[PDB]
Amino acid sequence: EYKTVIPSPYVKCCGTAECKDKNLPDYSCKVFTGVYPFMWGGAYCFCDA
Amino acid sequence: VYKATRPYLAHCPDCGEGHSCHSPVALERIRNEATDGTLKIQVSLQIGIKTDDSHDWTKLRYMDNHMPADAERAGLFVRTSAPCTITGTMGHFILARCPKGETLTVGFTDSRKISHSCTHPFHHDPPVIGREKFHSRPQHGKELPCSTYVQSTAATTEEIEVHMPPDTPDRTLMSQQSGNVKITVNGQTVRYKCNCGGSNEGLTTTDKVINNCKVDQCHAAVTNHKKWQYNSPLVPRNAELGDRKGKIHIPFPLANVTCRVPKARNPTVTYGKNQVIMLLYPDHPTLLSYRNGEEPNYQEEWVMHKKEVVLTVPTEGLEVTWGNNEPYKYWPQL
Amino acid sequence: VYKATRPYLAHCPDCGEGHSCHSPVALERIRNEATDGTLKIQVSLQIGIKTDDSHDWTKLRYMDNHMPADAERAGLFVRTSAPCTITGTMGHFILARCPKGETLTVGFTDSRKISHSCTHPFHHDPPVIGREKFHSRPQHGKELPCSTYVQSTAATTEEIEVHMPPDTPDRTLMSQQSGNVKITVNGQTVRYKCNCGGSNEGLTTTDKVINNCKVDQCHAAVTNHKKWQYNSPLVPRNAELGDRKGKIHIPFPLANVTCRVPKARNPTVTYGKNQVIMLLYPDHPTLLSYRNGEEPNYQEEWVMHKKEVVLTVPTEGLEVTWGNNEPYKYWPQL
Amino acid sequence: VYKATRPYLAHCPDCGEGHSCHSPVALERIRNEATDGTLKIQVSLQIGIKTDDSHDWTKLRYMDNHMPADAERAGLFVRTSAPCTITGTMGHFILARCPKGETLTVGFTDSRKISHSCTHPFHHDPPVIGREKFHSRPQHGKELPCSTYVQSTAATTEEIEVHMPPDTPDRTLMSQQSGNVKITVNGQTVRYKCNCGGSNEGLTTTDKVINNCKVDQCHAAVTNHKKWQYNSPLVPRNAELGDRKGKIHIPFPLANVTCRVPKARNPTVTYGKNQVIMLLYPDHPTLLSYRNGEEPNYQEEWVMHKKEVVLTVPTEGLEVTWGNNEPYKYWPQL
Amino acid sequence: PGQFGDIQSRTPESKDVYANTQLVLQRPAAGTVHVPYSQAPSGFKYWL
């Protein structure tokens, strides 16, 4: 049986993150734009867009 | 190890009545590799540890908004379609024996009551160990190889990834002075970002002021660097540091053990021309399997109640297995 | 409105262990028109109102034999095959999210403890909203039209019929003076009937005496005329007055809202001569639907586990919908 | 009869979490001959009797290691897949109405709390009385013959076998004098065995000494002779006496009674050439049965929801039974 | 993916393993920190 290693996502506030080709089995990387995430005490990022 | 680690708040899709929340009892991962049916559940809180890091089995520590708080272990519950039997608890891990279900819920009680629960969709229907679907575990029976998560507190084999925390958002950290932004740290590490010029970074251990900026243009979140947290996909990564990782041993690892399985009673056997007739009287669901030579033609059926079975015995021979009993062998007379 | 209305005792077929009783928690009607699965339950008692008519969410009022009494809201419970999640309570109405069941039970606790429950046969298995059978409600998902009973206290649209009460039988109202029947009203409206001549009717607001009659030959019951009660088929109509009716607005009306849902993963797609092959890997039950031109030939199946599907793609085209995902369109190459 | 009998400790395969123990609430036999679904459960303890032999319905007596002790009747519980409804308790016997299950658990609470339970594998799914699968028992309905275990305390018909005890191990009976083994009887019958020469048998009513032997090499157990105990296959037979047996009457015997059952609505009937068409609208599961002449060809089906049935009416005639309704008779026109 | 050999390890002690599991990362929910994904179920569990 396989196992899916998912680390903490890199939320780049006020910037654009870059995916690098890693030599790992079933390696998947995706950068999502227009993200505005929230934590318990409000928004995690200073920027709206 | 709990002096460096801490309980945390993470995303949960169902905190009650299908509504999402920043849960102090958030579900991370449910492990079901144990053939005995035992579930290894990972949660955002820490059981058996107090806020002062001391080990106490009657206590539980969870993230209460800004800082961790103590809760009772008796108030901790695990349920699927009905309540589960908790077999062991230590830190982020829970061991439970659950009935058949489609969801998995883990909850607790604070100090001022207020029940916090986290529901995740999880198909639980553990496969049968052996050839008999029984309810309670017996003292005596056939010894069959099975896997379980050991009840032992000790952490020596299995592990999890840990790193410095992210940022609990809190808008109360910022105020208007008088038409500018004032960030009051209160002896904590606060990560701030403002939609204004000059200074808008950090990670600060001291109070900061942003002149000619509005309170709505700014974002504040509890800072850190002094503590460790599980590398959770439900909590964001620390932006300042790179791919900095730590690792800690975890309790209840999976190991090869023995499972005791019950049996049944030998059926009343009657013979015929190249055939065998068995009057099966099962007290519980019992697996009935049979095979022939070159063409075995394997057939199986779970016998629930009183059933008469007519089986053809070929010249090569017929092998019949009735539950946990040793296989019966039949041959025709020349 | 609760100054005019009152909680009451009505017939229940099962008050515990299959035995019928005059229940203070009697079930009137169970409404299940809400597509989201929410049940609107009508009961004989009144939740959120005290005996003095004042509104208090922590309190409950029920008919305690002769007069109404106060009870705790925390002690109120709703269950089918397992306990339900109560989403709202006001007067005779309860909103609940229940698991799959064949019966519906609503109960509470008095003052001197004593649990009162009412069980009615009710088939509860709410239909799936969308094309995915999920457990917990998500924050983000596809917006689909659904109906629910609103959580709001306000009563402006829906209504129930009300009228002056029926009759609570009480033998303590009658006594022998000295070998005749004495009916002592005690500032109430009492309906009496005696198996003797002269006067045996009413409905009286004053004390009445029946000469040369036995106490066993008479029947006494407390009415009312000053209060209103739901037009219940489990309570008799007032014989004196005709078809006199009243009406009151009720909380939690049914309304059109939006239900959030999730989606599945895109299957590994392989093509062939006028056909499409999909390797479906569902994590939970997922609806698979497809249609062709003039003859659409609609077909649907709930996919539970790993299944390979071979679908014929006609010249006109084939539309395939896999769970909550947007429909896939397929056309053959010329 | 309880002055001669006593509660006892016996083997139980599951005392909690699949572990075997010497249980004070051990299950002996579960009787399910009652067609109404009532279970007659036999246990190792005695309900409604105190240690001083006096009858008290609020009390329970169980074997507390060496001597019997008092416990509360309120703490006594019976459960299968969910809790059962206890209908009667007296001595070793419990009457219970249980939901569908695969195991049977009977438990209680001591004095210093400590819950004791005994789980046995038992398939419980009681058959339907009549032709309708209902939940709660009605006041009015069709009178059908059924069997039950009567609620009455009185013991006049049914019986159980009793005899002098077997063996209760007690290490306090032996002491070192000064480096040898001293067995102090204390006016009881004690069975002793020592891993030393000379004398190591009995069954003694007097004090015995074993010279040049260690206390760890010896085994002591209280026999008894003054009390009676149920002839339990979970407790050993008294070795000294032969096949000496006693017998006592037991409460709640099985008897022929009447069970009240319910019914439904006449379907919309349409006729055709040698056939009958019925549009069935059931509110709950309803049994539909039919028969023809010389060849009746009996057929039956449980109707759950809206279903149209097409039945062939032969020249001899057709009899159709829809639930608890009187059978409908159909004949073709000449 | 979803078949016998979706994950292949030369020896049970091997560090680098082969993997072909239909792992596809999805866009996170509005204002939510999580990593949603769609994945072919265990080939070994399927083979069992």
DSSP letters, B121-169, are EEEE-PPPSSSB--SSPPSSSEEEEEEEE------SS-EEEEE-----B
Question: Which of B136, B138, B284 has the CB atom closest to D123's CB atom?
Answer: B284
DSSP annotation of B112 reads S
CA angle E37, E41, E46 (to 5 degrees): 180
For residues C39 and C124, is the Cβ–Cβ distance under 8 A?
yes
Total length of chain A: 49
Lookup: tokens for D237 = 């037979």
Test the E interface: residue of B20, B35, B118, B147 with most E CBs within 10 Å: B20
> In this structure, how many other beta carbons lie within 10 angstroms of the beta carbon of residue D59?
17
How distant is the Cα of B235 from the closest Cα of chain E, in angstroms? 6
Beta bridge partners of D62: D69
For residues C98 and C124, is the Cβ–Cβ distance under 8 A?
yes
CA angle C222, C224, C225 (to 5 degrees): 155
Lookup: tokens for D290 = 């039919």
* Local structure of B227: helix, strand or coil: coil
d(CA C177, CA C169): 21
Q: What is the CA radius of gyration of chain C?
A: 29
d(CA E35, CA D6): 64
Q: What is the CA radius of gyration of chain B?
A: 29
DSSP annotation of C267 reads P
Question: Which of E17, E24, E28 has the CB atom closest to A28's CB atom?
Answer: E24
Q: Which of E34, B225, B11 shows the shortest CA–CA distance to A11?
A: E34
d(CA B128, CA B262): 12
Sign, CA torsion C145/C146/C152/C158: positive
Instruction: Tell me if B139 and D102 make a contact (CB, 8 A cut-off).
Output: no
D312 phi/psi in degrees, rounded to 5: -80, 125
Chains that contact B by 3+ CB pairs under 8 Å? A, C, D, E
* Local structure of C249: helix, strand or coil: strand
- C121 chain-D contacts, CB cut-off 8 A: 134-136, 284
CA of E24: which chain C residue's CA is closest?
Answer: C265
Provide the terminal-to-terminal Cα distance of chain A, rounded to the nearest Å. 41
Q: Which of D127, D36, B81 shows the shortest CA–CA distance to C81?
A: B81
Beta bridge partners of D11: D22
User: CB of B17 within 8 Å of any CB in chain C?
Assistant: yes
Which experimental approach was used here?
cryo-EM
Test the B interface: residue of C36, C136, C149 with most B CBs within 10 Å: C136
- B16 chain-C contacts, CB cut-off 8 A: 85
Beta bridge partners of D269: D278
User: CB of C100 within 8 Å of any CB in chain D?
Assistant: no
H helix or E strand, kind and range, residue D94: strand D85-97
- A35 chain-B contacts, CB cut-off 8 A: none
d(CA E29, CA D68): 63
d(CA D256, CA C203): 47
Instruction: Tell me if E18 and A36 make a contact (CB, 8 A cut-off).
Output: no
Lookup: tokens for C325 = 């995902």
- B260 chain-D contacts, CB cut-off 8 A: 18
Instruction: Tell me if D18 and B283 make a contact (CB, 8 A cut-off).
Output: no
d(CA A42, CA A40): 6
- C265 chain-E contacts, CB cut-off 8 A: 22, 24, 37-39
* Local structure of D304: helix, strand or coil: coil
* Local structure of D172: helix, strand or coil: helix
Instruction: Tell me if B137 and D19 make a contact (CB, 8 A cut-off).
Output: yes
Q: Got the DSSP string for C106-142?
A: EEEE-SS--EEEEEEEEEE-PPPSSSB--SSPPSSS-
d(CA B59, CA B76): 10
d(CA D318, CA D311): 9
For residues C190 and C220, is the Cβ–Cβ distance under 8 A?
yes
DSSP annotation of B83 reads B
For residues C92 and C42, is the Cβ–Cβ distance under 8 A?
yes
User: CB of E34 within 8 Å of any CB in chain B?
Assistant: yes
For residues B63 and B70, is the Cβ–Cβ distance under 8 A?
no
d(CA D132, CA D259): 13
Q: Which of B75, B88, B90 shows the shortest CA–CA distance to B45?
A: B90
For residues B71 and B183, is the Cβ–Cβ distance under 8 A?
no
What are all long-range contacts of B200-203, with beta carbons under 8 Å and residues at least 24 apart? B200/A46, B203/B240
Instruction: Tell me if D14 and B136 make a contact (CB, 8 A cut-off).
Output: yes
Instruction: Tell me if C135 and B20 make a contact (CB, 8 A cut-off).
Output: no
Beta bridge partners of D46: D61
Question: Which of C139, C266, C283 has the CB atom closest to E32's CB atom?
Answer: C139
* Local structure of E46: helix, strand or coil: helix
DSSP annotation of D5 reads B
* Local structure of D133: helix, strand or coil: coil
Q: Which of B233, B218, B175 shows the shortest CA–CA distance to A13?
A: B218
Tally B–C CB contacts below 8 A: 42
For residues B82 and B99, is the Cβ–Cβ distance under 8 A?
yes
CA of C259: which chain B residue's CA is closest?
Answer: B18
Chains that contact C by 3+ CB pairs under 8 Å? B, D, E
CA of A4: which chain E residue's CA is closest?
Answer: E23
d(CA D134, CA D259): 12
DSSP annotation of B39 reads E
